[PDB]
């Protein structure tokens, strides 16, 4: 819900917050270069946690990859398997919380 | 379109200009007292011109007295001709500018 800011007067603004989110994908290693130029720009709101925020970035992969699915197939990759995979998203340290810069992995961050 | 403001760092920051109007009735001066409670609190954006303001104001007349559009038959009023009337918004002075308070009328601010 965007803040609404009263200056007496007459006037009353809105802002909303929000953070420009850089996503390095490590998914498949193949078809890495490619989800890192058209689904790896985002723009999320600072009260965001990242276990919805992976949501949003799940939804993306796939809506970038179903109209390019027959040429994913010799690759052995499976749209219909990756619609129900884990993304897991942390920071460039490793842990999930918010950041600029963010992994997409279908593994934990290590250990 | 919400003005985005750049912070550095990755925090982006949506901010869209608003004004607080109330708008004093001057339509029948028999239901400019309901007109006045229940629909004179308006919050427009301050670069909206007053000829387009005037069309949601129409709108939130008539939506206002469309319930009971069966009681103003007794008193005279048609809402038919009303959907189709002309709303004219001055300022307190009669001009065609906005301010925190407008009036409202069928007719032009004298002259």
């Given at each position: 819900?965007?803040?609404k800011?009263?200056?007496g007067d007459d006037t009353v603004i809105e802002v909303q917050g929000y953070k420009s989110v850089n996503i390095t994908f490590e998914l498949d290693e193949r078809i890495d270069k490619?989800?890192?130029?058209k689904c790896s720009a985002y723009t999320v709101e600072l009260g965001t946690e990242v276990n919805e925020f992976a949501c949003v970035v799940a939804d993306a992969?796939?809506?970038t990859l179903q109209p390019v699915?027959?040429?994913l197939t010799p690759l052995g990759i499976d749209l219909d398997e990756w619609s129900m995979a884990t993304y897991?998203?942390?920071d460039e340290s490793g842990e999930f919380?918010?950041?600029s810069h963010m992994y997409c992995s279908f593994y934990p961050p290590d250990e």
């Open positions: 819900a965007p803040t800011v009263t200056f490619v989800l890192n130029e992969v796939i809506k699915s027959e040429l897991y998203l942390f919380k918010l950041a």
